[PDB]
């Protein structure tokens, strides 16, 4: 009986030590925990969720929504939602964000049901298409309505995708910034400065890799046990009014991993903005089984001296089973909307 399940599962929890006070407390933490849901919209959104799912994202429910049934069936997630079951019949919205938006609206109640009791929701997707670009802002609007920390981690299209797609992305990015607490944007075009002679046929595979790493890094920073205390109250603090944000990723293998990883992360072409005054930042330093709090401490210090002396900085350090002799640093600087300008050919640096 599935219905008994939830109730008999507590029997084991409750039933050999603690006192009555600790009895209530322990039984309290059970519920108190922060519920995280990541929602992937459209093509790139769905490829990301599948990996997060298959690789096992820690402490977060995965939701994949799509207007296209073919894509949705190949996707793996804790929950899948075919938005626009009446508007599209599960055939795809094409490159028209207006359809994807309407598709999401149509399934709004279904979406709300998938993120219902979430303390924080991550909306991820690749802008430029019709589904992700159209639905993402609706999922964000619904997220805020249920009262969850609403963060979005999205990518801007490659220039080789065309002005129509970029323009649609920027407009989507605009509508999105309206319903998010913090909006993280990844310019795919810069993916070319990290891998200059990267084969065009691989651009998207790499884009998938970066988004997955970014969403996973941010999410796990909050949920995965590490060498140090990462409190949800702080995340709430930094993410809550983080306007526009960008990321930087780096890693090193040399006997100056931490130091060299920060360098890459800070000089990352993905950080297409002046960060020398940032008011907030989330840092996640991942490494091998030999990772010391000292290295993580060295990364944070490095970054801290670039931001505002008053900058709010959340950081963590987790150990990744299969991580070489390499330490990877995911950097997320917030409140940089005033250093950028929204145009329809991409974001421009002020």
Swiss-Prot record:
Kindly state which keywords UniProt assigns to this record, in alphabetical order: Cell cycle, Cell division, Cytoplasm, GTP-binding, Nucleotide-binding, Septation
Instruction: Please indicate if the UniProt record lists Ribonucleoprotein as a keyword.
Output: no
The molecular function terms in GO held by this entry are: GTP binding; GTPase activity
Q: Where found in the cell?
A: Cytoplasm
Q: Does the keyword Cytoplasm apply?
A: yes
GO cellular component labels? cell division site; cytoplasm
Where GTP binds, per the record, is at: 43-44, 93-95, 130-132, 161, 165, 208
- Database matches in NCBIfam families: ftsZ
How is the quaternary structure described? Answer: Homodimer. Polymerizes to form a dynamic ring structure in a strictly GTP-dependent manner. Interacts directly with several other division proteins.
Family membership, please give it.
Belongs to the FtsZ family.
Protein name listed in UniProt: Cell division protein FtsZ 1
Q: What are the leading ranks of the lineage?
A: Archaea, Methanobacteriati, Methanobacteriota, Methanomada group, Methanococci
- Gene name? ftsZ1
């Amino acid at each position: 009986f599935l219905k008994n399940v939830l109730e008999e599962g507590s029997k084991l929890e409750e039933f050999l030590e603690l006192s009555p006070e600790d009895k209530e407390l322990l039984e309290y933490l059970q519920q108190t925990k922060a519920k995280i849901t990541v929602v992937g919209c459209g093509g790139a959104g769905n490829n990301t969720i599948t990996r997060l799912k298959m690789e096992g994202i820690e402490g977060a429910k995965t939701v994949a929504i799509n207007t296209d049934a073919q894509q949705l069936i190949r996707t793996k997630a804790d929950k899948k939602i075919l938005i626009g079951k009446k508007l599209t019949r599960g055939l795809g919205a094409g490159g028209n964000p207006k359809i994807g938006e309407e598709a999401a609206k149509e399934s709004a109640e279904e979406i709300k049901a998938a993120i219902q009791d979430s303390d924080m929701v991550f909306i991820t997707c690749g802008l430029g298409g019709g589904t992700g670009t159209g639905s993402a802002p609706v999922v964000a609007e619904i997220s805020k309505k249920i009262g969850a920390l609403t963060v979005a981690v999205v990518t801007l299209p490659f220039v080789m995708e065309g002005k129509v797609r970029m323009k649609n992305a920027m407009e989507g990015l605009e509508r999105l910034k309206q319903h998010t607490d913090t909006l993280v944007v990844i310019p795919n075009e810069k993916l070319f400065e990290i891998v200059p002679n990267m084969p065009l046929k691989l651009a998207f595979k790499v884009a998938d890799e970066v988004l997955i790493n970014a969403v996973k890094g941010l999410v796990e920073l909050i949920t995965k046990d590490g060498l140090i205390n990462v409190d949800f109250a702080d995340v709430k603090a930094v993410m809550n009014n983080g306007g526009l944000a960008m990321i930087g990723i780096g890693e090193s293998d040399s006997e100056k991993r931490a130091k060299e990883a920060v360098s890459m992360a800070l000089n990352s072409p993905l950080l297409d903005v002046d960060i020398d005054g940032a008011t907030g930042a989330l840092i996640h330093v991942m490494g091998p089984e030999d990772l010391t709090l000292e290295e993580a401490r060295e990364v944070v210090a490095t970054v801290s001296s670039r931001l505002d002396p008053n900058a709010t900085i959340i950081w963590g350090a987790t150990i990744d089973e299969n991580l070489e002799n390499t330490v990877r640093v995911l950097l997320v600087i917030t409140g940089v909307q005033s250093r950028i300008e929204f145009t329809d050919t991409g974001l421009k640096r002020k």
